[PDB]
Amino acid sequence: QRNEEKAQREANKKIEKQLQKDKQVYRATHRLLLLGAGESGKSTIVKQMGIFETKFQVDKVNFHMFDVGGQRDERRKWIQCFNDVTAIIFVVASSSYNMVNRLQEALNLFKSIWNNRWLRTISVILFLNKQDLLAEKVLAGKSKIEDYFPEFARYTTPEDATPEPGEDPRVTRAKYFIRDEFLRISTASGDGRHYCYPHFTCAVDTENIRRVFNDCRDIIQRMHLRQYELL
Amino acid sequence: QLRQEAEQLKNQIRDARKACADATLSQITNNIDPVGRIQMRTRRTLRGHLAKIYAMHWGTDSRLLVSASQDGKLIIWDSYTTNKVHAIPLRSSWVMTCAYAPSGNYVACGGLDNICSIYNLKTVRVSRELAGHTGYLSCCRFLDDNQIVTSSGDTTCALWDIETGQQTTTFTGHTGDVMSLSLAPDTRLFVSGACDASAKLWDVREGMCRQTFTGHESDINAICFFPNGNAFATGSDDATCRLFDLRADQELMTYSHDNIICGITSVSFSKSGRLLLAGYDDFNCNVWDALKADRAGVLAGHDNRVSCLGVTDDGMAVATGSWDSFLKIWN
Amino acid sequence: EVWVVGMGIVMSLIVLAIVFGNVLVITAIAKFERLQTVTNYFITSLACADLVMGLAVVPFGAAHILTKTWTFGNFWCEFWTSIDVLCVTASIETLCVIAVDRYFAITSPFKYQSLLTKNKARVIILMVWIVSGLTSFLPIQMHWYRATHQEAINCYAEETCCDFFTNQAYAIASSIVSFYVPLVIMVFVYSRVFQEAKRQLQKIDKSEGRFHVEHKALKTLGIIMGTFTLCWLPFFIVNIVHVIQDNLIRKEVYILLNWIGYVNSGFNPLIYCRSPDFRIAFQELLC
Amino acid sequence: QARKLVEQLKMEANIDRIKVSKAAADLMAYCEAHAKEDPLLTPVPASENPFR
Numbered sequence A: 001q002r003n004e005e006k007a008q009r010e011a012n013k014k015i016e017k018q019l020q021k022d023k024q025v026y027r028a029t030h031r032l033l034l035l036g037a038g039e040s041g042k043s044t045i046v047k048q049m050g051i052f053e054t055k056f057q058v059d060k061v062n063f064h065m066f067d068v069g070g071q072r073d074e075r076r077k078w079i080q081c082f083n084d085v086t087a088i089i090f091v092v093a094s095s096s097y098n099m100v101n102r103l104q105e106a107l108n109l110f111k112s113i114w115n116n117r118w119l120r121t122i123s124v125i126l127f128l129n130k131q132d133l134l135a136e137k138v139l140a141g142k143s144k145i146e147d148y149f150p151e152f153a154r155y156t157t158p159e160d161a162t163p164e165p166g167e168d169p170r171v172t173r174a175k176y177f178i179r180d181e182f183l184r185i186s187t188a189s190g191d192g193r194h195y196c197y198p199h200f201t202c203a204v205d206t207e208n209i210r211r212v213f214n215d216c217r218d219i220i221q222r223m224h225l226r227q228y229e230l231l
Numbered sequence B: 001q002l003r004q005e006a007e008q009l010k011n012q013i014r015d016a017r018k019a020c021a022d023a024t025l026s027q028i029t030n031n032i033d034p035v036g037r038i039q040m041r042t043r044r045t046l047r048g049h050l051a052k053i054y055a056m057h058w059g060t061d062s063r064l065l066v067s068a069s070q071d072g073k074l075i076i077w078d079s080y081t082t083n084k085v086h087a088i089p090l091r092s093s094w095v096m097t098c099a100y101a102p103s104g105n106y107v108a109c110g111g112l113d114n115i116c117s118i119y120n121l122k123t124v125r126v127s128r129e130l131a132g133h134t135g136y137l138s139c140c141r142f143l144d145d146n147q148i149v150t151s152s153g154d155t156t157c158a159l160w161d162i163e164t165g166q167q168t169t170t171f172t173g174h175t176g177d178v179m180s181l182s183l184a185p186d187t188r189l190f191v192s193g194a195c196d197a198s199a200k201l202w203d204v205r206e207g208m209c210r211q212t213f214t215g216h217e218s219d220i221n222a223i224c225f226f227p228n229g230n231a232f233a234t235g236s237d238d239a240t241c242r243l244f245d246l247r248a249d250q251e252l253m254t255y256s257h258d259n260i261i262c263g264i265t266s267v268s269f270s271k272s273g274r275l276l277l278a279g280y281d282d283f284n285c286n287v288w289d290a291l292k293a294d295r296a297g298v299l300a301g302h303d304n305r306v307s308c309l310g311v312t313d314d315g316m317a318v319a320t321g322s323w324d325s326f327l328k329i330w331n
Numbered sequence C: 001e002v003w004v005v006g007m008g009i010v011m012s013l014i015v016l017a018i019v020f021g022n023v024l025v026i027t028a029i030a031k032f033e034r035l036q037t038v039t040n041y042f043i044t045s046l047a048c049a050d051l052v053m054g055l056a057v058v059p060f061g062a063a064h065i066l067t068k069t070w071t072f073g074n075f076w077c078e079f080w081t082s083i084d085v086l087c088v089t090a091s092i093e094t095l096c097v098i099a100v101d102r103y104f105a106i107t108s109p110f111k112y113q114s115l116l117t118k119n120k121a122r123v124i125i126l127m128v129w130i131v132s133g134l135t136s137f138l139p140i141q142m143h144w145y146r147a148t149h150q151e152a153i154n155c156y157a158e159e160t161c162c163d164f165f166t167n168q169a170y171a172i173a174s175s176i177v178s179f180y181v182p183l184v185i186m187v188f189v190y191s192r193v194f195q196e197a198k199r200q201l202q203k204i205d206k207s208e209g210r211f212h213v214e215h216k217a218l219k220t221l222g223i224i225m226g227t228f229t230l231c232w233l234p235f236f237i238v239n240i241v242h243v244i245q246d247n248l249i250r251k252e253v254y255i256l257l258n259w260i261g262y263v264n265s266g267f268n269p270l271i272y273c274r275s276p277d278f279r280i281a282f283q284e285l286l287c
Numbered sequence D: 001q002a003r004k005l006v007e008q009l010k011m012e013a014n015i016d017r018i019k020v021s022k023a024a025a026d027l028m029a030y031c032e033a034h035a036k037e038d039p040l041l042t043p044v045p046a047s048e049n050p051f052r
């Protein structure tokens, strides 16, 4: 009779109430994808702050970072699952310009992620890890960046920049060239929907969580400002 | 070395298929009257999913269906009364497949985490967490109440035993990432389409591949047997759907149009096999007349790409689960 | 008369434009599930206010102007005036609420999801409509807006003449509730939004200056605020003045500025419903 | 690993096949025979429609 209908309606109401309660939490949290090459510093960044899930909260905001080991392959068919994440955190070792080039492989990966059809709105937060090792390599004359990257010979330091309080000009040029390659890749195919935020991080830094928080805030602010005809 | 032998065998297989290709499906079915225009309307819309949906599966009775969404929720709907019977939470938010057991008592669920989860509806807790895969798990189907076959990111497809939680047999020998699979009506054979252009056919009992088909030119995202069990249709990313045959290995008919360029995400057959409903990335589905390769209708109404598709066992309703968080049951 | 017909044609065109735009936006929001959003509830509240405006007060007022007399009852005059005040107050308050929603979404992005929800958006619209009703119907239907001077009491006694005569207190309170307070709120929130947009543009120029990577923000804020200000501020200044000064403002100027304020209801969907989603919805529905 | 591939190719190459005409005839015959029992091919009466 109608007893079954009444029971089904009660179950539906309870399920809907639970769904709203869970939806509050789901909309109150932000999902991030940690996607970088192996041994590039992903483990260090995870420690600082099939699938590895790390949840950290800053300023009463829930961030849910997801790092995927998976299988080493270039297809990345699972990348379409992350078309609704707040941002994609890209960790790359900038000191691997001479090692086997690892930097060229990372640039190709960044270009593939940037031009992906599903990731046409997700901004990318870029971490240029192992900064100290890059400085040590640059100071030593064993390896020349111009040899591995021919464009470095014609490159010149930016007129406007932010050099460190104690930094050599040579390592400054190296770091800015490494950043500028990724920035050029980001800008060439960009349409204003998603930007790239490069950061010169080190294994000894402690404020990378603040940097990620600020970049996420900027990402959401720019999304809101672009939804309306502003910015 | 063995490369010359492999090339000779491939050439022999191609020559045999050409020798068996005397006629074409189009020529024989040309004299048949066209199916005509089919108009479908959303009889029931199911709402309650917080985000995008990747899978759905009808029950043995056409009343119940289970849908998997990246919310971490596995909701079992009642199609007739648009009521949520169950809303199963998930350990991992990322889910890429779901399955509803023919017995109606068990539900499978797997995602980016390599584990496959089996839930007990009549008792809602994880009966068994089937582990052993390496890549992301892609599809699940229930051979029976105790046996389940899974396809994961790695090249291997595995047949599991729920009671023991171990791989009874493993179907390997493929190249790409396996994306979808479909069981035979007799539950003795199944196929598997993958990112590789090939779509092999596997024997459950023996555990060895029998035939392979390489008609496509891109990744295969969906696959489904003909109701006869003697043929199947695959959905690729090349904006083409092809109907293969088990008896004659060569592809029979191809379903494509110049206007559409987006890939196919999900395919399914009607009860009589006349209509090949296929989901697309153009935010709408297309109903293909299987015997003529002529479009018979358009299933529009989804705000995002359709990622799930299924036709009831009775053949009465067809439901599409898109990245738009809402199901849509047509008729 | 040739001159009389022309005003009739212009007012008929105004009515048609208002009704068409408002029904278009309302049906676009209602029919399509993708167009239902927390901001879209405020948008459809504004659309409903403009639609009831263009259906009730614009045509009856046009007939009153053309006929130069009120053929309906005195109760109908009071009802029409109350509906007019209700529509104006609801429309302007809803515009202010939309501005506040945009300010909260831009300035406080992390908390924006928590502050505004589907359930919490309904209360705000209900609050706006209750405020507008308390501003309009109560001082009019309870006869608190009636003036005391000889002309007003002579007009009110006659049932054939329907003109607006208001007291100092009611005019000041109605103006403050309807326009001036929402104007201040809009100015503040849009100044904050402009500052945020300029700051983000400066950050973008810092990050991607050498590569090609606030004209647009200025244009959008101009089309949003200038149209709202130019439509209603000229009416409200004289609304205050003709009560402060008993002879400064003539009736024809008052009515002309009131209708210039009215046409903002028609202009609203052009300003606010211009996203690609609305464009696609309008193209699908109209064709 | 090519030995496994060539063995599989040899195993799957020695199978019996029928002409495309026979398979197409079987598919057409099945579609014609089971056309009546298809609720999507032809709309069902509103009384017989569960969803309606």
Ligand SMILES: CN[C@@H]1CCc2c(ccc(O)c2O)[C@H]1O
Residues within 6 Å of the ligand: C081, C084, C085, C088, C089, C164, C171, C174, C175, C178, C258
């Ligand atoms: C009859 N016309 C009315 C008279 C006064 C008035 C209007 C609109 C909003 C207000 O807050 C008002 O006080 C005008 O539309």
